[PDB]
Design a protein around this ligand. Sequence first.
Ligand SMILES: c1cc2ncc3ccsc3c2cn1
Ligand SMILES: [Mg+2]
Ligand SMILES: [Zn+2]
Length: 321
Amino acid sequence: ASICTSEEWQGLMQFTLPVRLCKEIELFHFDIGPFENMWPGIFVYMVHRSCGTSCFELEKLCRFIMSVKKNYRRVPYHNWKHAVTVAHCMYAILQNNHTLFTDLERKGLLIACLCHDLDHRGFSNSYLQKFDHPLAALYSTSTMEQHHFSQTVSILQLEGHNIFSTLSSSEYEQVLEIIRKAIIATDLALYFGNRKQLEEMYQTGSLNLNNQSHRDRVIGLMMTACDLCSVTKLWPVTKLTANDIYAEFWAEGDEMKKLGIQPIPMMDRDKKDEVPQGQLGFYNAVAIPCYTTLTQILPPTEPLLKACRDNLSQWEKVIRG
Ligand SMILES: c1cc2ncc3ccsc3c2cn1
Ligand SMILES: [Mg+2]
Ligand SMILES: [Zn+2]
């Protein structure tokens, strides 16, 4: 784990967010893309708005964030920008559903969203497992996601970073278990089971947010909705993020080609024409069901389902030349 220099974390404490942005940040379709220098600060703003201006030591929160930012790599998609996009979509969800969640959950989730793809190397779980990478050794299933939570704990545990230390001991364990579970749920592989279970609970009318296991599933889906929120932005933001996503896919493909292995068409840059159909399969099979389940469960999240439906209708218009 890398530590942020003293110069970095102090600049953030001073940061004041344009009052004209405070209005936009509250919207689901909000895009953070055009605001790079203000990401660390927009996240602090989000923390304070959601869990109070006295959630954490500001000196610690700022240390933590800048060090988190530092342990995200410069790969094309799974980078610092993505971590913050996911945190924002979660803030937007938390904000619209505030009391359904405890104060320890809100702070748990915001941080897990920031921390969720920490130290990503731009390679899928499959890859690492297929070619027996040390990380596949260390972690059998949900490989990257386990490493991310490893990193989350290994930052929390740096001199003066532990924004949770003033929690009671039963609250500290409690909060780190939200974090663990939320992160693990960003393993898309686990999402389809989760989604499927929750759907039933709903239809039956036997879904029960008091019941912990149910809550843990609802949080699971929230994490997936958040991880995928590229697809709920305005068409040109969506098109542009998709570019960065595939840039990473292709660069994973490139190493498999290099290795005399043919990559799936998703990770093969010489199969660009299949992307519009690739997208249309992902949206039908994954995103739509996701936001469709999230909106039955937490109805304020409608405009996420609405936006995704809009961008689906758009990939269609690219299939027709
Ligand atoms: C946004 C768009 C996407 N399009 C395709 C695929 C495929 C795997 S994750 C993913 C994806 C994730 N976020
Ligand atoms: Mg991930
Ligand atoms: Zn992610």
